[PDB]
Amino acid sequence: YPLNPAVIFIALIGWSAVAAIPSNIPVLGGTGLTQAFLASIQRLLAQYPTGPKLDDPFWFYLIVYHVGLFALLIFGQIGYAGY
Amino acid sequence: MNLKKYLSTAPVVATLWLFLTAGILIELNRFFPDSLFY
Amino acid sequence: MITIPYTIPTIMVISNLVGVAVGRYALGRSDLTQLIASMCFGHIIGVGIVLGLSNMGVI
Amino acid sequence: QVKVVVDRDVVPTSFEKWAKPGHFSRSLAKGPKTTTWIWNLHADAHDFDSHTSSLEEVSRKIFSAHFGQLAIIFIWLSGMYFHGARFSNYVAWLSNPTGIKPSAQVVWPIVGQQILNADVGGGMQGIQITSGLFQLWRASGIVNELQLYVTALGGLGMAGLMIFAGWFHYHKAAPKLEWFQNVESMLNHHLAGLLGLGSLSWAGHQIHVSLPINKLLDAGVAPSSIPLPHEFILNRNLMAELYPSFQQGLVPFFTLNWKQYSDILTFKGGLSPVTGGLWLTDVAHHHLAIAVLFLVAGHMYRTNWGIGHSIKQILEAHKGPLTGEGHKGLYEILTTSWHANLAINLAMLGSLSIIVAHHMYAMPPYPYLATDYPTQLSLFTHHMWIGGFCIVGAGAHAAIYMVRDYSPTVNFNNVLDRMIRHRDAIISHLNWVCIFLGMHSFGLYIHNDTMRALGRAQDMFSDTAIQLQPVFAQWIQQIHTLAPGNTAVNALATASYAFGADTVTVGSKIAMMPIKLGTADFMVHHIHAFTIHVTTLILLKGVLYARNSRLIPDKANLGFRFPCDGPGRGGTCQVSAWDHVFLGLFWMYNALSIVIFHFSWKMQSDVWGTVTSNGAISHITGGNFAQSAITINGWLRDFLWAQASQVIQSYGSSLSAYGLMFLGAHFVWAFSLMFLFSGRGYWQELIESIVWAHNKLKVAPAIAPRALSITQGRAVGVAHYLLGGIATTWAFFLARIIAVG
Amino acid sequence: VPFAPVPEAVRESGLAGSEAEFDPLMITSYLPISWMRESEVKHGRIAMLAFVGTLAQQAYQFPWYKGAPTTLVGAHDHFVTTALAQILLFTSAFEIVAGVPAAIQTVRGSGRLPGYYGFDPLGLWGKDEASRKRMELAEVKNGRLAMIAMLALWHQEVLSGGMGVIEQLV
Amino acid sequence: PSMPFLKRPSKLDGSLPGGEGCFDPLGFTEVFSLEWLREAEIKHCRVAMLAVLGVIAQEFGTFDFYNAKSKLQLSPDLHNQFVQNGALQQILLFVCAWEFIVGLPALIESVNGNREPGYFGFDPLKLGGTVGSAQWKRMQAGELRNGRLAMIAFGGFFHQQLLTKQGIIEQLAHF
Numbered sequence A: 001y002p003l004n005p006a007v008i009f010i011a012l013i014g015w016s017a018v019a020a021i022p023s024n025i026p027v028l029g030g031t032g033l034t035q036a037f038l039a040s041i042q043r044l045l046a047q048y049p050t051g052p053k054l055d056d057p058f059w060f061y062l063i064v065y066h067v068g069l070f071a072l073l074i075f076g077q078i079g080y081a082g083y
Numbered sequence B: 001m002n003l004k005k006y007l008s009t010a011p012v013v014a015t016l017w018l019f020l021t022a023g024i025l026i027e028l029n030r031f032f033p034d035s036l037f038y
Numbered sequence C: 001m002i003t004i005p006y007t008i009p010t011i012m013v014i015s016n017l018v019g020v021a022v023g024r025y026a027l028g029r030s031d032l033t034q035l036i037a038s039m040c041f042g043h044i045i046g047v048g049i050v051l052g053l054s055n056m057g058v059i
Numbered sequence D: 001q002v003k004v005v006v007d008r009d010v011v012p013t014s015f016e017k018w019a020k021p022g023h024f025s026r027s028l029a030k031g032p033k034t035t036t037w038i039w040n041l042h043a044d045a046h047d048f049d050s051h052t053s054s055l056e057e058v059s060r061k062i063f064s065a066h067f068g069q070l071a072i073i074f075i076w077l078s079g080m081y082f083h084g085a086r087f088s089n090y091v092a093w094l095s096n097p098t099g100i101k102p103s104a105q106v107v108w109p110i111v112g113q114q115i116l117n118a119d120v121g122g123g124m125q126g127i128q129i130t131s132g133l134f135q136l137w138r139a140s141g142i143v144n145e146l147q148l149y150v151t152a153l154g155g156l157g158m159a160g161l162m163i164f165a166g167w168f169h170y171h172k173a174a175p176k177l178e179w180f181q182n183v184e185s186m187l188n189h190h191l192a193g194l195l196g197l198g199s200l201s202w203a204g205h206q207i208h209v210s211l212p213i214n215k216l217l218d219a220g221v222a223p224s225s226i227p228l229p230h231e232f233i234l235n236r237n238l239m240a241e242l243y244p245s246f247q248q249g250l251v252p253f254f255t256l257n258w259k260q261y262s263d264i265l266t267f268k269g270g271l272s273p274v275t276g277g278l279w280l281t282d283v284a285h286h287h288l289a290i291a292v293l294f295l296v297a298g299h300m301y302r303t304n305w306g307i308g309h310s311i312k313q314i315l316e317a318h319k320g321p322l323t324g325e326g327h328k329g330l331y332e333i334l335t336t337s338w339h340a341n342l343a344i345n346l347a348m349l350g351s352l353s354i355i356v357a358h359h360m361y362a363m364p365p366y367p368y369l370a371t372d373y374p375t376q377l378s379l380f381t382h383h384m385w386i387g388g389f390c391i392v393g394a395g396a397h398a399a400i401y402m403v404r405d406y407s408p409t410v411n412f413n414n415v416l417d418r419m420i421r422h423r424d425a426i427i428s429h430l431n432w433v434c435i436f437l438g439m440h441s442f443g444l445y446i447h448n449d450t451m452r453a454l455g456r457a458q459d460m461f462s463d464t465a466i467q468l469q470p471v472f473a474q475w476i477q478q479i480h481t482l483a484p485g486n487t488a489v490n491a492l493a494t495a496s497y498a499f500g501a502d503t504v505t506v507g508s509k510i511a512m513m514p515i516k517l518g519t520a521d522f523m524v525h526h527i528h529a530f531t532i533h534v535t536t537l538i539l540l541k542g543v544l545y546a547r548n549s550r551l552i553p554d555k556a557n558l559g560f561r562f563p564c565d566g567p568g569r570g571g572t573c574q575v576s577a578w579d580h581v582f583l584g585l586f587w588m589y590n591a592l593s594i595v596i597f598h599f600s601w602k603m604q605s606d607v608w609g610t611v612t613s614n615g616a617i618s619h620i621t622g623g624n625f626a627q628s629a630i631t632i633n634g635w636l637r638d639f640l641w642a643q644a645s646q647v648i649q650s651y652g653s654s655l656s657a658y659g660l661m662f663l664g665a666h667f668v669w670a671f672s673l674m675f676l677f678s679g680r681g682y683w684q685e686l687i688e689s690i691v692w693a694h695n696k697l698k699v700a701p702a703i704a705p706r707a708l709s710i711t712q713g714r715a716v717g718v719a720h721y722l723l724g725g726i727a728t729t730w731a732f733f734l735a736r737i738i739a740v741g
Numbered sequence E: 001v002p003f004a005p006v007p008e009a010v011r012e013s014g015l016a017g018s019e020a021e022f023d024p025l026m027i028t029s030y031l032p033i034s035w036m037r038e039s040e041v042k043h044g045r046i047a048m049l050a051f052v053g054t055l056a057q058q059a060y061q062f063p064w065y066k067g068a069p070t071t072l073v074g075a076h077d078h079f080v081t082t083a084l085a086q087i088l089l090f091t092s093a094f095e096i097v098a099g100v101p102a103a104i105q106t107v108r109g110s111g112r113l114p115g116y117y118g119f120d121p122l123g124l125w126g127k128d129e130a131s132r133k134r135m136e137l138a139e140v141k142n143g144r145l146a147m148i149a150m151l152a153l154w155h156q157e158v159l160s161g162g163m164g165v166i167e168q169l170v
Numbered sequence F: 001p002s003m004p005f006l007k008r009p010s011k012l013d014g015s016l017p018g019g020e021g022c023f024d025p026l027g028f029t030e031v032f033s034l035e036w037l038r039e040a041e042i043k044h045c046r047v048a049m050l051a052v053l054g055v056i057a058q059e060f061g062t063f064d065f066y067n068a069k070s071k072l073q074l075s076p077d078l079h080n081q082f083v084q085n086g087a088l089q090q091i092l093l094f095v096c097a098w099e100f101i102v103g104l105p106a107l108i109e110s111v112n113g114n115r116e117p118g119y120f121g122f123d124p125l126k127l128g129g130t131v132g133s134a135q136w137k138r139m140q141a142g143e144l145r146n147g148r149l150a151m152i153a154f155g156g157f158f159h160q161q162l163l164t165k166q167g168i169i170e171q172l173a174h175f
């Protein structure tokens, strides 16, 4: 059934770049939607047991990033329905 | 004509009759309340 | 609502013209209901643009 | 295409067929040679899809019966407005709502029962309302008794329009099937006309009645200096003082200067701390959002003008590869059978009613609703139970569609029967999820039960013991704390005070407190996940095995309400698709009994109660949940034993009717069990051994006295299990919280 | 090519009167002309009688209870409260028993000229000829002319300062 | 049409005593079988003629011994001077006889269609009580029209209260 498992990475630029340059200031991210996450993973990446439930820019930009990323890669498989 | 035949069925007669005996007891317990004698 | 220099009716008629441009594409018969449907859609798009241009940003 | 084709003068309106009971079914007009004709007179009285296969005559019957239902609903609501008018203390309640307990029904003075007339203040006694009608009326803006008499009068008038309506639509103008299968128009008028104009016109009522009136009552004006709702529309000068945006008229509406309507309409959320309810500015703005959004939503169905969809060209385009055929067939499924539509509409109606229950405890939408806790309680509880039963009707009427109106020709390789091709893999993983959740939702209670009983309280699942803090609920609850500044940008307060900031105290009574969810509430949520998955197991087993099981490979031939097949296959008692609905009603009583027992005890420990000075806190049970919900001795002691003290000591007082509806509802509960455990092969010749005692005295009844049938004899066991078991919790709840709230 | 518009024909010729057949938008093609013709006539009525109601708005002998609300918005501010809700009522109750069977009976399919045959102490109207339809056609042209006159008389004051009509010529 | 009106030619009626015509613009005689509505029309017109002659004859100022009227409406003084006498209870109760005893089977004669649904007998007249063709119809139209004008005219006789609060004789002493 999975006839065309061609590419995945086209969704990534398809989801980061559509949310990076829109800032939309007064929310959690005063910067863009993805810069407020990729900036907020390198503080925690080098073996940090922190990041509690009050850690807004990590935990919130986990779900609000992956819920569009999942949908846009699923629609990337819908991007092999016209084949 | 047939309306009285509907009013002669089992539940309708049972409500026009148990409504009546229930009215006998309720009206006979406002007029004579607390009747433990007789 | 002021005249021809840039205001709210300036940015409604362009949404209605691109709305009736959609009606030329979405079952593009030249009947009445292209106008009554599609000018209504560009009217929805127009109202969604106008206050959205009014809330976050200068009009 | 779309047109209206209606037969006129269809059925004569004589009383002739009332004299033939059981006229309707050709299998039943034989006359009663047994008493089972009596009961089958009633179970076949609404098998409209089993009188005659002609869908036109069926569809006329049902669509005319709907107006009978709405006739009873308008008689009922006119009853509520008249009992609010004549009998209630509503005008007195409107003076001080936090002191006067709401009551309408004033019990007639016969022997003793005048003690049920509770002295609820207002200079007049009577049994206390817990339905919360007065909070709906203060939100409506009903000032004096005259609008209740007039609205009850209009309730009778609409009841007459529904009686004359259904009479007019079965007999002397009844439509064809081509009128009924016009479903793009039916959605096109319900999404827009019913719901759209309902919410829009209700926004008109709230803005031009409720906003000025519940601004004047929010100022605290007695209902004498308040003018008529009427008198706000004759001149804007009585509303321009209250909201200065009425002075500009509709000119800022049509110029799209909707910033100017910030006085009338806003997005605040939270709760008004004076009245304890929602801001009616938010509620009127809300119904405008449903108004524009539903009126937009109506126009997606092409009817006459070639503009819109049909359902067919939508469903056929979802031809996904894991289903193969896609939804090819469902528009012929859902426009020929009514039980399928009843399954969908009952499922979504019941789940909407549960959504109603949650959104009424945590965002109390009526003024002074969360300050009289019984109306706060039971309006949660009641919309749960119709929120429950209407789901099982889904599991009934999705079963009936699979038995009666299923057709494999129209329904070949689509999304529907490709489920039935792997219904073993459906029911088997529901089976696994039920056992996994049962161990991990109830074995935790046996565990903490034993660990508290074995003394080793360190080995429990308490706060102090092995903690099971619900991570996700606390996290997204914290997102809702961080709503009104971050993401709901134009908000001011949170979506509720069940999420975020400090509590709302209205008249020394706690409106809503931020509910903390820790390590006991976790396990009760896994109860709810568990007992939802069991009813989903029984009601998907009752639909997927409705027609051709691998045990009995002809249930479509046997029917829907067949009892069984026999002692063969080692016994196949209780095997029909009806019987899974029979079991889903018990598990309905379980699942909702622990939904409301989770409610009425976590919100007597973590929300409700009173406050004293310096912001001090005092719940009704006093924080006695998280140390006590983790066991079952803590559950049964601290809730079902300790909360009984205001039900059981209620004799001599005004709550004593509940003390009668507590005992007797135990009775009916246990009286159900006689119908559940025994069977008609006992009762039939017990009865016939009594028929000997009538034949001896020539008191032989002509209608021969059978016992009940099997499906009846179990259906009555459900219908007493639920009336008895539900009315126990009914009288226990209302007898509990009236003695406090 | 129906003699008013651009060279684009109109299907409609089925007994509506006023033979010009002016359908640019083809609303006739989606709504029946008995209904709409009763709206042409029926708006024409209010155009007539409201036009000379504005001609008699500032004129000779009154019911004599006024002198301040000579304007039009001010008329809809003063009279609506007390003196004009029965001007709503006595044509509402006329309308629910007259116009409802008229328009609903014509759109249901009854054969009737949508003028709802009424009081006629005047008119030629005995010769079943074009002179009846000449008074029909003159009636609807006078109606729409009065209607355009009502946007005139509405716009002769709002962009002129809430003033009168005949006083504008000074 | 058969109606002297806009248009509805003989929907279900046309031989009833409308001497000026059959009015019927709204769909009641469409589906109400018309005998019910005729019994209701005639009973309402009789009781309304009794109502209007009640109001006028009481407004000629007559009491055995009661209060000054100042009105024949507005329940406490008039109506609950009468009820607290224990007096209107019987004048309701005898009509509670009349309708259930001789109006209900009379209405059963308005069920089957064998009544001409007015007709409680009752002509105590010589030289003018014609049960036949001419004077029965042209006088039944008199009861009908005077009863309808009794219905509306009793409507105005009730509703002259807000700007009046006085008698209708005092309304005649006012403009």
Ligand code: CLA
Residues within 6 Å of the ligand: D063, D066, D067, D070, D179, D180, D182, D183, D185, D186, D189, D190, D192, D193, D194
């Ligand atoms: C926009 C018009 C409109 C409106 C408002 C409704 C409203 C309703 N329909 Mg409905 N329907 C419509 C158009 C409409 N329909 C059309 C066009 C079709 C054909 C495709 C249907 C086919 C249909 C079916 C098959 C059924 C309904 C039902 C219902 C009721 C649902 C129960 C409810 O919500 O209780 C809330 C109740 C109310 C809000 C009361 C509203 C009543 C007032 C008077 C409005 C009714 C308007 C009425 C259509 C006018 C008749 C016109 C006639 C005089 C010429 C509700 C009254 C169901 C029902 O219960 O039957 C009655 C049902 O089974 N409808």
Ligand code: CLA
Residues within 6 Å of the ligand: D431, D434, D435, D436, D437, D438, D439, D442, D443, D446, D534, D537, D538, D583, D586, D587
């Ligand atoms: C209190 C009585 C009771 C209990 C415990 C159960 C329990 C269960 N029912 Mg149920 N049921 C009941 C009454 C009860 N029912 C009644 C009254 C009805 C009437 C309508 C039904 C109708 C019904 C239906 C229709 C179905 C069930 C099903 C199930 C199972 C769901 C899966 C689960 O929870 O696994 C977890 C097990 C438990 C929570 C039981 C406790 C076990 C503990 C936690 C662990 C074991 C204890 C101990 C370690 C044992 C070893 C020691 C020992 C050997 C010495 C579960 C066993 C479903 C089924 O059969 O498959 C899923 C199903 O379809 N029931």
Ligand code: CLA
Residues within 6 Å of the ligand: D439, D440, D441, D442, D443, D444, D446, D447, D450, D459, D466
């Ligand atoms: C089903 C619910 C449940 C759960 C989760 C627990 C859990 C626990 N109980 Mg227990 N208990 C229960 C029910 C339960 N109990 C019941 C119903 C009773 C009474 C009949 C008791 C009576 C009881 C006693 C008397 C005691 C405990 C104790 C304990 C603790 C240690 C037991 C142990 O060694 O685990 C055994 C665990 C295993 C052998 C591992 C099997 C489970 C694994 C994790 C499944 C993994 C599958 C995996 C995910 C598959 C996917 C991977 C794959 C694809 C590769 C532990 C917290 C003891 C204690 O002191 O508490 C601290 C103790 O003394 N319990």
Ligand SMILES: CC1=C(/C=C/C(C)=C/C=C/C(C)=C/C=C/C=C(C)/C=C/C=C(C)/C=C/C2=C[C@H](C)[C@H](O)CC2(C)C)C(C)(C)C[C@@H](O)C1
Residues within 6 Å of the ligand: F072, F073, F074, F075, F079, F151, F152, F154, F155, F156, F158
């Ligand atoms: C007094 C009594 C009560 C009050 C009871 C009242 C009296 C109830 C009765 C009300 C009725 C009598 C009022 C009816 C009014 C009639 C309405 C206003 C319509 C009137 C005219 C209609 C028929 C229009 C007529 C067009 C008139 C027009 C000129 C054309 O030619 C056509 C034509 C004829 C259709 C209480 C409740 C107040 C208190 C009690 O204690 C006692």
Ligand SMILES: CC1=C(/C=C/C(C)=C/C=C/C(C)=C/C=C/C=C(C)/C=C/C=C(C)/C=C/C2=C[C@H](C)[C@H](O)CC2(C)C)C(C)(C)C[C@@H](O)C1
Residues within 6 Å of the ligand: F049, F050, F052, F053, F122, F123, F124, F125, F146, F147, F149, F150, F153, F155, F156, F157, F168, F171
């Ligand atoms: C007939 C029957 C009997 C008779 C039974 C009764 C006695 C017959 C009498 C019936 C009368 C009561 C008929 C009533 C008719 C309607 C009345 C007359 C209404 C009048 C209103 C008119 C005057 C208009 C009033 C404007 C009403 C308006 C509101 C303003 O304020 C102004 C005002 C007053 C001008 C017998 C026994 C005598 C004889 C038998 O054979 C049979």
Ligand SMILES: CC1=C(C/C=C(\C)CCC[C@H](C)CCC[C@H](C)CCCC(C)C)C(=O)c2ccccc2C1=O
Residues within 6 Å of the ligand: B014, D674, D675, D676, D678, D679, D680, D683, D706, D707, D708, D709, D710, D712, D713, D714
């Ligand atoms: C008790 C019992 C019966 C016997 C129930 C009997 C037959 C019905 C008793 C109630 C009826 C309604 C009593 C009949 C009374 C009539 C209504 C007339 C009485 C007069 C007035 C009440 C109107 C069963 O038939 C049965 C069947 C299958 C499983 C369990 C059982 C079961 O437990």
